[PDB]
Design a protein around this ligand. Structure first.
Ligand SMILES: O=c1c(-c2ccc(O)cc2)coc2cc(O)cc(O)c12
Ligand SMILES: [Br-]
Ligand SMILES: [Br-]
Ligand SMILES: [Br-]
Ligand SMILES: [Br-]
Length: 274
């Protein structure tokens, strides 16, 4: 599939930088014809067939195809795609209140935690209903619309690892951030929608405590901890957190993907269910 090959700068003016990663940089932009504002994600293309640098066309096309499907208040939306020799440029919905990660750096109450978590669950319910596994859920990939309200609204971003799961499981080269990946990822096993549910358990643990459940001193330690389900609820952090909240986490941080709560289970769980 090919994308718009006119110069993006003929149609958009860019401004402040919103985010920066290994192969991508994201800039605020404004569309000249409408005055409407967006986030332009510039993704570096591969220069040769066998290069490890840049993102493969196959990977870019997968991400774009998934993004085009999505329309939901808790997930980022895609406006347009441009490309040139060096980059694919995604014109994405602008979410200006920063990362959940940076907001958290500023411990919540259980209500504040569940207000975020319910939105995340709603977004993931939508995604999983479309058989889309995100595979990179973490506070850095949750953006706030406006961080200056008591109950910020959020959208899930970063579909760079996202895959359609048409056969219940995928078996590809897929591996996200060690603190958040499920044991099946660590062990290079077939992956499904279940991996996201584990990541949600990790996010929930962090929301409530300010601490990461599996984090070791090196990435290898973290990965080994994940695979062994080496986490516990520290009393210093969780002493005034409800046992029902801990139950929710416990049912997500389960090694066997078949025994882990699904997104539907998570919405019916007594901690979440209205
Ligand atoms: O999507 C984003 C965003 C992003 C996208 C849309 C917004 O409205 C705001 C940030 C920011 O930094 C990144 C950084 C990355 O490495 C990868 C990404 O996908 C992103
Ligand atoms: Br700007
Ligand atoms: Br579902
Ligand atoms: Br994104
Ligand atoms: Br994206």
């Amino acid at each position: 599939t090919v994308f718009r090959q006119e110069n993006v700068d003929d149609y958009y003016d860019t401004g402040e930088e919103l985010g920066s990663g290994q192969f991508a940089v994201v800039k605020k932009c404004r569309e000249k014809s409408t005055g409407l504002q967006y986030a332009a994600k510039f993704i570096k293309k591969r220069r040769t067939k066998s290069s490890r640098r840049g993102v493969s066309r196959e990977d870019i096309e997968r991400e774009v195809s998934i993004l085009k499907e999505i329309q939901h208040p808790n997930v980022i939306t895609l406006h347009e795609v441009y490309e040139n020799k060096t980059d694919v440029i995604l014109i994405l919905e602008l979410v200006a209140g920063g990362e959940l990660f940076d907001f958290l750096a500023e411990s919540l109450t259980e209500e504040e935690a569940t207000e975020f978590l319910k939105q995340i669950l709603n977004g993931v319910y939508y995604l999983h209903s479309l058989q889309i596994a995100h595979f990179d859920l973490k506070p850095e990939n949750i953006m706030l619309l406006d961080r200056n309200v008591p109950k910020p609204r959020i959208k899930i971003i970063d579909f760079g690892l996202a895959h359609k799961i048409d056969f219940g499981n995928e078996f590809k080269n897929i591996f996200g951030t060690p603190e958040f990946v499920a044991p099946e990822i660590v062990n290079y096993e077939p992956l499904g929608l279940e991996a996201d549910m584990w990541s949600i358990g990790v996010i929930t643990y962090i929301l409530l405590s300010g601490a990461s459940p599996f984090l070791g001193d090196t990435k290898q330690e973290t990965l080994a901890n994940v695979s062994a389900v080496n986490y516990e609820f520290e009393d210093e952090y969780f002493s005034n957190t409800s046992a029902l909240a801990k139950d929710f986490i416990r049912r997500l941080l389960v090694k066997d993907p078949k025994k882990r709560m699904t997104i539907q289970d998570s919405l019916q769980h007594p901690w979440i269910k209205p």
